[PDB]
C-alpha cells in the first residue's frame, strides 16, 4: 500500500542503530502517524501475500473476553502458543481488560458495551475510549499490551478510530495489526447504523530488524495494486454475535509471499 | 511558533462543524501530530504573550501526588478552583495516578519512580510509560484526564517523550499544555545525566471555538519570532526536590496578549 512503503523507506533513511529485548539489532525511529480512508478499500497489504484467517479468529476471541487459548486451538490458530502456559492460560491480557477491568472496589467494567452505548446515545462525546494498559496487572500478564489504547469519533455519519501502538515490528507485524482494527471499525459501524470513515495509526518505537533488510529491499521494488473490498454477509443481533463465515474479501491480488525468520 | 500556526490554519480549512459538552459551537478535526526539537529553544509561543508561573506551580504539584488545591491556593494559583469542592478536594486526578495508582490487591504504584529506574538501568526498554487513565476511578474524578498518557525514549544520549491528548482547545489551552511537558523532559534529563531531544505531540478531537475566531485570525497575521531559552539554576538531589525559583527564561520577546472569553 502507498502509505506502508513510505514508513519502510523512512526507517531506512532516518533510523538509528540499537537493540531490542537484548538480542537482534534494529534501526528505529520514535513517533509516526498515518491515515487510511476506509472508503477507498480494505487496507490489506498487496505488496506481499497475506491472510485474514488468524486475524478474524483472534478478534472474535478478544471480544468474548476469555484469555485461555482453547478456542484458538480448536480452530488451528497457533500465534499465541509461544507465550501460553501449561493449562493454556496467558494471564489477564487483552480480552480480559476489554470486557472486565477489575476495580479496587469489587466490580468488572465492560468497556466494549460502554463504548456502543456512547456512540449510540451521545455520539459527540470526547471520551469514547478503550484501554488495556492496567498498571496494577502488568506483572501477571505473559505479555504487556502492544496495541494498548484506542479512541472512537463521529462526524457526518462516519465512524473513525485512532490507535496508539507503543512497539511495532514494521516487517512482520504491522500488516497483521492494521487489517485487525480496520475490521473492528467496520463491525462497529454496522451495529451503529453508520458508514465507515478513517483509521488513524500512531506509533512509538517503530522498527526494522537487521535480518529483514533483504526482504525489505525486495518489497520496496514491487508496485502496489488496488485494495480489495470487505463484504459482510450477515447482520448479527449485536457485537458479540459474529461468526467466522460472516466475512469475505474481493478483488485481492497480491504479489508473492515472503518469509520472516526470527532469532531465539 | 512555526508549527502551532499551521494547526490553527488546518482547523480552519479542514474542520467540520459541531458542538461540545452541549454548549458553544466548534470546528474540529480528528488526529494530528507535531514535533519540537528541544535543542532549538524552549517552545513557548511568541505570537501572543504567555506566562510560566502557573505552569511551574502546577507541575511541582503533580509530582508530589497531592490532589487538594491548598498549595495552589497558598501561591495564588486559581486554575483548578472551578472544579474543586468545599474542602478543596478534586478526587483522584493526575498526581494521584502518577504517584499511587490503586491496585485490586492492596498496593499503590509510584509510576514516576518506576520511570527513572528504567531510563537509568535499562534505557532501551520499549515500555517506559506513565498513565492516568484508570478506568475504575473515573466516576470519582472531578474531571476525566485530558493529557492522559505518555511514553519516554532514549537514543544517542538524548531523551524524547510522546504525549497522547484526547481533547484540546487549540486557542486557550494548547500553549499552556506544550510548555508544561516541555519542562518535564528537561527536569527528567538533568536527573538522568542526559541531553534533551524531541517532544512529540499527538491529539484526537482537536478544536477551535466559534467565539475565538476573531482572535485566531489576528494571531495568524503576526510573524513568529525566535524561541527563548530555559535556564536551570540548581541541580536538585532528585525529581521530588525542585523549587519555584530554580527556573528562568531568557530572550523571550512575544507580541501582545489576547483575551479568551468563555461561555457558562
UniProtKB/Swiss-Prot annotation, chains A, B:
Belongs to the thymidylate synthase family. Bacterial-type ThyA subfamily. PANTHER family: THYMIDYLATE SYNTHASE, THYMIDYLATE SYNTHASE 1. Changing residue 177 to A: Shows 200-fold decrease in catalytic activity, 20-fold decrease in affinity for dUMP, and 10-fold decrease in affinity for mTHF. The active site is at 146 (nucleophile). Homodimer. Changing residue 50 to Y: Shows 0.2% of wild-type catalytic activity, but substrate affinity is not affected. GO terms for biological process: dTMP biosynthetic process; dTTP biosynthetic process; methylation; regulation of translation; response to radiation. Pfam families: Thymidylat_synt. Keywords: Cytoplasm, Formylation, Methyltransferase, Nucleotide biosynthesis, Repressor, RNA-binding, Transferase, Translation regulation. HAMAP family: Thymidy_synth_bact. DUMP binds at residues 21, 126-127, 166-169, 177, 207-209. This is Thymidylate synthase. Its EC number is 2.1.1.45.
